[PDB]
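User: I'm designing a mutation panel for bacteriorhodopsin and want to avoid disrupting the core. Could you give me a predicted structure to guide residue selection? Please restate the sequence first so the numbering is unambiguous.

Assistant: Good idea. Sequence first, for numbering, then the predicted structure tokens:
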Amino acid sequence: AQITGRPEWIWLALGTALMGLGTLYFLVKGMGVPDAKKFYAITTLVPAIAFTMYLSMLLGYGLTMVP
């Protein structure tokens, strides 16, 4: 879809925002108010990694990050 059928950049931005808030929320849960500490950390950094990847992606193209 070189004709840009949809703003995947915006969709990515939204997805990154969601993932970000998700990571923060997960960290809050981890803070306090199943297998290993490492596993739990990764599980709590699931949204953190997702956000990082999405941020790197949007940055790669330079659409939302570089309007």
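For picking mutation sites, this is relevant: Residues 1-67 form a domain with the Helix Hairpins fold (CATH 1.10.287.170). Residues 3 and 32 are 47 Å apart (CA to CA).
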